[PDB]
PDB file of C-alpha atoms and ligand atoms in Angstrom:
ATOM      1  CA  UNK C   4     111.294  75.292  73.045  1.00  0.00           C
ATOM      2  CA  UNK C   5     107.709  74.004  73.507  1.00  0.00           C
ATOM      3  CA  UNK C   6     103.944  75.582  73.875  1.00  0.00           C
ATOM      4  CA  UNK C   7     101.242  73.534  76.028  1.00  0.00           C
ATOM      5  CA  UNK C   8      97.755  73.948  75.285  1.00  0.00           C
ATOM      6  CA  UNK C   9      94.954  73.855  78.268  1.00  0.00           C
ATOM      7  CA  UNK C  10      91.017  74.497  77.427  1.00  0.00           C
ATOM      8  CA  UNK C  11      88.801  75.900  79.883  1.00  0.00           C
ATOM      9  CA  UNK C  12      85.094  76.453  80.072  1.00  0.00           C
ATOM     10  CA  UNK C  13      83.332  79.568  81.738  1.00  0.00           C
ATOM     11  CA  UNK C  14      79.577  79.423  81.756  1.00  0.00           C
ATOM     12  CA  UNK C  15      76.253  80.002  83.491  1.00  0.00           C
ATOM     13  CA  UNK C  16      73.193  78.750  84.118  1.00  0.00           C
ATOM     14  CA  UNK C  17      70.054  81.665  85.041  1.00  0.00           C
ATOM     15  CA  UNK C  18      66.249  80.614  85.491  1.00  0.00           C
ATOM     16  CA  UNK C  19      63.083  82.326  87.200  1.00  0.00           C
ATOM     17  CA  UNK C  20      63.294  82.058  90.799  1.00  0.00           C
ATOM     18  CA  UNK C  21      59.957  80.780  92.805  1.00  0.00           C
ATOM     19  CA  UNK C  22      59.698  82.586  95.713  1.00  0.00           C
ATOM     20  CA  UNK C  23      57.283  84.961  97.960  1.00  0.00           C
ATOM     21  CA  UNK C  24      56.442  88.128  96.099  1.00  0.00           C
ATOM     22  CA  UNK C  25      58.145  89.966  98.623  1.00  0.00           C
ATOM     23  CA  UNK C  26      61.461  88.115  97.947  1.00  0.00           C
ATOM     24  CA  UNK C  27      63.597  91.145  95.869  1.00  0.00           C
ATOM     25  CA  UNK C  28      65.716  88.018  93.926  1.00  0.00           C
ATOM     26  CA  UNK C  29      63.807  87.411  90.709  1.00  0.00           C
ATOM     27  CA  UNK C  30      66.800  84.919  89.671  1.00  0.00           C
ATOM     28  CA  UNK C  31      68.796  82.244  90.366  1.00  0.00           C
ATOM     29  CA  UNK C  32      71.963  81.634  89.058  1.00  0.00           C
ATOM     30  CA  UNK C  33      75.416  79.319  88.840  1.00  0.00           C
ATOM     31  CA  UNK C  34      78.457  80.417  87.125  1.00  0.00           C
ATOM     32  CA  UNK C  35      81.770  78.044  86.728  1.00  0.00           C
ATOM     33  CA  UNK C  36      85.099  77.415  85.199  1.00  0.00           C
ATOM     34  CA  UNK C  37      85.657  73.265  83.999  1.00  0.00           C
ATOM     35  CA  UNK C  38      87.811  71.648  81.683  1.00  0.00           C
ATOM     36  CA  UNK C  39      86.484  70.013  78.601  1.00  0.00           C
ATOM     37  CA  UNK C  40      85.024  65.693  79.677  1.00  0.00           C
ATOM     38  CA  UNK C  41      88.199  63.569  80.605  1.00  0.00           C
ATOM     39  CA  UNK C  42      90.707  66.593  81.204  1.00  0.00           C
ATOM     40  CA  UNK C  43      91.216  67.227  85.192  1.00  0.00           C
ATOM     41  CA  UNK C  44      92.144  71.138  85.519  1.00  0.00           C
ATOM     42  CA  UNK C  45      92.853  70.718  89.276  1.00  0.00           C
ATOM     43  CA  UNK C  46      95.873  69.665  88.088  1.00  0.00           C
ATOM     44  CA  UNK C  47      97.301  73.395  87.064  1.00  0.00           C
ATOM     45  CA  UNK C  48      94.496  75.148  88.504  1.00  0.00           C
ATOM     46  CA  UNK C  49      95.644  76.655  92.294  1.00  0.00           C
ATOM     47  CA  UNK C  50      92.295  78.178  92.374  1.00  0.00           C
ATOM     48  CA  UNK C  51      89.283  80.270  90.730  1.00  0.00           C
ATOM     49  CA  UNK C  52      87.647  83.512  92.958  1.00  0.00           C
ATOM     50  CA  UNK C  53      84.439  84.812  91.697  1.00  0.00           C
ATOM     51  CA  UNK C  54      84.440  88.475  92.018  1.00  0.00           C
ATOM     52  CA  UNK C  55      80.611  89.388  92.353  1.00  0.00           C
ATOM     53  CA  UNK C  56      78.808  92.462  92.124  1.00  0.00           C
ATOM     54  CA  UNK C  57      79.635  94.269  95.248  1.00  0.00           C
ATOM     55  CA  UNK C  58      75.987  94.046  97.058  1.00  0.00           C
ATOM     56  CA  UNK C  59      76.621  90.291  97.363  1.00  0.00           C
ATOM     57  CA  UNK C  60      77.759  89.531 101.004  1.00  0.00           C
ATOM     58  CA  UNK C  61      81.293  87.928 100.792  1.00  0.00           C
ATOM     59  CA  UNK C  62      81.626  89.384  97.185  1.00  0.00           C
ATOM     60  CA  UNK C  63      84.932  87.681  96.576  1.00  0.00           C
ATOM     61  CA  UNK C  64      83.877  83.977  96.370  1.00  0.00           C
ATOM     62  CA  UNK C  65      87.079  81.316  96.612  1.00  0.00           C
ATOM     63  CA  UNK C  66      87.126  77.594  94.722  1.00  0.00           C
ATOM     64  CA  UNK C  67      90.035  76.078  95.849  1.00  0.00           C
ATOM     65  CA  UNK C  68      89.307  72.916  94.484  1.00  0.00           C
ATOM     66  CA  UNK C  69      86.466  71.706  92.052  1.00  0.00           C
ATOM     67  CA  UNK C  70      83.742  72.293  91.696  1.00  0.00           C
ATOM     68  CA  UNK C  71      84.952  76.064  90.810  1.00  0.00           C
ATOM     69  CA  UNK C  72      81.503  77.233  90.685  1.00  0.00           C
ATOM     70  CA  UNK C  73      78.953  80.192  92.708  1.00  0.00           C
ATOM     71  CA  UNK C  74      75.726  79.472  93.087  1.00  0.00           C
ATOM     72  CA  UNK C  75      73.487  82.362  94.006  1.00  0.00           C
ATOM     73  CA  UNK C  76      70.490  84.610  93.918  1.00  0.00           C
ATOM     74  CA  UNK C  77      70.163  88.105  91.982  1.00  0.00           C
ATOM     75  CA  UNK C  78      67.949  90.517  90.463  1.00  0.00           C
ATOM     76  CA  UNK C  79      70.228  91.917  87.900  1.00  0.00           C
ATOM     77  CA  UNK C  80      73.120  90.470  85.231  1.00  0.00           C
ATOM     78  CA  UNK C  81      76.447  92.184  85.838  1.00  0.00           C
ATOM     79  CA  UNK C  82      80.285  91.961  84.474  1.00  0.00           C
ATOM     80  CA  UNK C  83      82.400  89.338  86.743  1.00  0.00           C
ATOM     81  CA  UNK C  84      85.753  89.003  86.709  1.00  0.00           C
ATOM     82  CA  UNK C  85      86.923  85.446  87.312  1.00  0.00           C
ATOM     83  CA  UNK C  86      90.298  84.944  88.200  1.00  0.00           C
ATOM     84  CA  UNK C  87      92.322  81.179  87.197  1.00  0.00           C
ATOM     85  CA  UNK C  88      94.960  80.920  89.558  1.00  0.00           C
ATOM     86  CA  UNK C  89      97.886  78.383  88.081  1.00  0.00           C
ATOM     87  CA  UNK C  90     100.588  75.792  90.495  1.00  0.00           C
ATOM     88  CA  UNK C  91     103.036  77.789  88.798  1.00  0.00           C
ATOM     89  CA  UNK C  92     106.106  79.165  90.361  1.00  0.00           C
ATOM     90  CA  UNK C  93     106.883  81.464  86.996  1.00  0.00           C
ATOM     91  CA  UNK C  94     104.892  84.061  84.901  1.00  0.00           C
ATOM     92  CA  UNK C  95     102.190  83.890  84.326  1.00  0.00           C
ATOM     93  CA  UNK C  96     100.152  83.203  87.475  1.00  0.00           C
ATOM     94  CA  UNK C  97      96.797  83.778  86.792  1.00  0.00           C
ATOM     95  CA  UNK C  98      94.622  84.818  83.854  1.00  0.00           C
ATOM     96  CA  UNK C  99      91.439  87.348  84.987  1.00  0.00           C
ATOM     97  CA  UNK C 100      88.262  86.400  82.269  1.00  0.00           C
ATOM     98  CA  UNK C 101      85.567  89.503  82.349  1.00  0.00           C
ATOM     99  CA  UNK C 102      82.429  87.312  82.476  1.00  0.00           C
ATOM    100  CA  UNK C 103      79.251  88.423  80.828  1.00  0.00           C
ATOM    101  CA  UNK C 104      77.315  87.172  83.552  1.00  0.00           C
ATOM    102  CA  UNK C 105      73.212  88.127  82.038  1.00  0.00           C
ATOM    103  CA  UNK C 106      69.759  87.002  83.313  1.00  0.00           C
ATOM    104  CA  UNK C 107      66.588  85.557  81.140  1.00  0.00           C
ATOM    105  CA  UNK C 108      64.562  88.456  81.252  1.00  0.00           C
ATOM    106  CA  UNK C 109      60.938  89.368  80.253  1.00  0.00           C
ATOM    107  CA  UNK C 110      59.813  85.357  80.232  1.00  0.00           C
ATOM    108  CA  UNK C 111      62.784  84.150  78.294  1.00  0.00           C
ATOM    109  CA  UNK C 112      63.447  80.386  78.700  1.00  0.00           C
ATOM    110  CA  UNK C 113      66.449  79.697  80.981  1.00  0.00           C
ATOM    111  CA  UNK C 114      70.175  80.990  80.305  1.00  0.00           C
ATOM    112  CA  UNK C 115      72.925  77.948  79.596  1.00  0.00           C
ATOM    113  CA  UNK C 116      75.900  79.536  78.218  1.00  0.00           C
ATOM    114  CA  UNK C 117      79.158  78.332  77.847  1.00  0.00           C
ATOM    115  CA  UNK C 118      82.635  80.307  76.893  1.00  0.00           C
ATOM    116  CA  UNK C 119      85.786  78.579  75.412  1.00  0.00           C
ATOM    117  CA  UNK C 120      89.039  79.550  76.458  1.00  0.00           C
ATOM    118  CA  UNK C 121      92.087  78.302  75.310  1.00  0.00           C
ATOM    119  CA  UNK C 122      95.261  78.906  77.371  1.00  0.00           C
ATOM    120  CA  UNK C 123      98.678  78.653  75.507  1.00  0.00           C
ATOM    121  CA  UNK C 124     101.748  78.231  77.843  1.00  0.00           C
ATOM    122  CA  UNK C 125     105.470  79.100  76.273  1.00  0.00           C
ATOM    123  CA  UNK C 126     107.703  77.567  77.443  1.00  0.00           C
ATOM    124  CA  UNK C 127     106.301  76.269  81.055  1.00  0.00           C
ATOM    125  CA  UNK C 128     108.791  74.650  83.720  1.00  0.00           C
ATOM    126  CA  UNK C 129     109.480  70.775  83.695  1.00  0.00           C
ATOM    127  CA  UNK C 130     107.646  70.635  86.524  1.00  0.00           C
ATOM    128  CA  UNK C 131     104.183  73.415  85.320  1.00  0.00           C
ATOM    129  CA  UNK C 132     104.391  71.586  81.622  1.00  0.00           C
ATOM    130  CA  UNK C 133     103.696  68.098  83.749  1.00  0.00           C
ATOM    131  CA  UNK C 134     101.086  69.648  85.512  1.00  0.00           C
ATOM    132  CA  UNK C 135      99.535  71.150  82.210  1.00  0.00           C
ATOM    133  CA  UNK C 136     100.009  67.508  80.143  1.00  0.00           C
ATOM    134  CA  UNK C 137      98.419  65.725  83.571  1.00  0.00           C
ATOM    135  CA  UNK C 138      95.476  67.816  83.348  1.00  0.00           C
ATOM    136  CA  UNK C 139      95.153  67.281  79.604  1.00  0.00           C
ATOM    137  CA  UNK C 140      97.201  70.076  78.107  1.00  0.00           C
ATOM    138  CA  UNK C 141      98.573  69.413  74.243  1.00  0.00           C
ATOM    139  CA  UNK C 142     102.164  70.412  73.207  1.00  0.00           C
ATOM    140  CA  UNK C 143     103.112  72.085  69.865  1.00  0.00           C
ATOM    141  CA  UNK C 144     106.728  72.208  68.409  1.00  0.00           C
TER     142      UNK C 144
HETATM  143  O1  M7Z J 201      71.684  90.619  92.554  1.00  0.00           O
HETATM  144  C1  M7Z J 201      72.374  91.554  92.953  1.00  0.00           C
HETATM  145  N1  M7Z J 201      72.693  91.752  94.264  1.00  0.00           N
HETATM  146  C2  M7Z J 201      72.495  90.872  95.366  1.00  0.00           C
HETATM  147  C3  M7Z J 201      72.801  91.369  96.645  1.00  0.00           C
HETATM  148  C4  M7Z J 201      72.719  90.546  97.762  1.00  0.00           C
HETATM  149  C5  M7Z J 201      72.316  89.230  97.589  1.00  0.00           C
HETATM  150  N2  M7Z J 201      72.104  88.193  98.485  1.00  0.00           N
HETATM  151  C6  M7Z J 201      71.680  87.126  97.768  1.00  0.00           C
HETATM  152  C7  M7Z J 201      71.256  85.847  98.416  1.00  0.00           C
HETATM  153  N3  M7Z J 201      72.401  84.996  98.766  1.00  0.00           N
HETATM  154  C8  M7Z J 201      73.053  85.470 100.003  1.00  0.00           C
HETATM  155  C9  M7Z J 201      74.266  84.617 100.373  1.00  0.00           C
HETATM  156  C10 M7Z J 201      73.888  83.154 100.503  1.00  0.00           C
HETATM  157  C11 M7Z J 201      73.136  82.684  99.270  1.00  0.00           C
HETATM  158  C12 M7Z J 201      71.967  83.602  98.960  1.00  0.00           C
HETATM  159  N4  M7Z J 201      71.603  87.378  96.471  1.00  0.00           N
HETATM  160  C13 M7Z J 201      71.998  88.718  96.338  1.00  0.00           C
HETATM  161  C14 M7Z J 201      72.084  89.541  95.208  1.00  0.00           C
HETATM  162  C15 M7Z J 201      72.877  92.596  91.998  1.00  0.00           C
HETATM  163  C16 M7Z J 201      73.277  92.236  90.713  1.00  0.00           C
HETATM  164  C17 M7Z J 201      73.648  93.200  89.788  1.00  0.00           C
HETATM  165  C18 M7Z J 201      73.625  94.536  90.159  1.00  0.00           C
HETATM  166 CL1  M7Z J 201      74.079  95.761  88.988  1.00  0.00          CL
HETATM  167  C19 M7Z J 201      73.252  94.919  91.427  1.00  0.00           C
HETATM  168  C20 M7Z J 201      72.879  93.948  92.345  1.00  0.00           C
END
């Protein structure tokens, strides 16, 4: 009987792009998944993919190692999924986050936005609860 613990952080970054008139992308943007300072995900993490609006060439963007970030161009906010992938050889897997992923419109200063997740593991493996302490993770009795 034990629960691990893991924190991860979604977020974005938007701003005004400078470009030629002509250019259609108004925006750039960079959207990621970290751990908190000091905790090394990589350690549980398999993988993230980015699943981006589907005008985006390549729409489903891989990070199979950090950083597990897209960097990009755009013209309009959308919803992204963002699958975490786990080294796990039990349920669950993976954990799909729907990520608010908005511009600065209308002159707004630039978007930095983080999100907070906590992950809580019952009763991981010997081997996935060593992965999960490794990369920071807390246990609970
Ligand atoms: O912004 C949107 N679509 C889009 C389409 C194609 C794009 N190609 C780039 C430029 N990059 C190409 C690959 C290499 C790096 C540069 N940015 C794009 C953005 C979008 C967002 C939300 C809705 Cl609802 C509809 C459309």
């Amino acid at each position: 009987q034990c629960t691990v613990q893991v924190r991860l952080e979604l977020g974005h970054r938007a701003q005004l792009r400078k470009k030629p008139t002509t250019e259609g992308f108004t925006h750039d943007w960079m959207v990621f998944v970290r751990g908190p300072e000091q905790c090394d995900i990589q350690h549980f993490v398999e993988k993230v993919v980015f699943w981006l609006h589907d005008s985006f060439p390549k729409p489903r963007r891989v990070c199979k190692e950090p950083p597990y970030k897209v960097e990009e161009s755009g013209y309009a906010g959308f919803i992204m999924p963002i699958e975490v992938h786990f080294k796990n050889k039990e349920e669950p897997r993976k954990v799909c986050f729907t990520y608010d992923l908005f511009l600065n419109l209308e002159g707004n200063p630039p978007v930095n936005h983080l999100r907070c997740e906590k992950l809580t593991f019952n009763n991981p493996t010997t081997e996935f609860r060593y992965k999960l302490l490794r990369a920071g993770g807390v246990m609970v009795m």
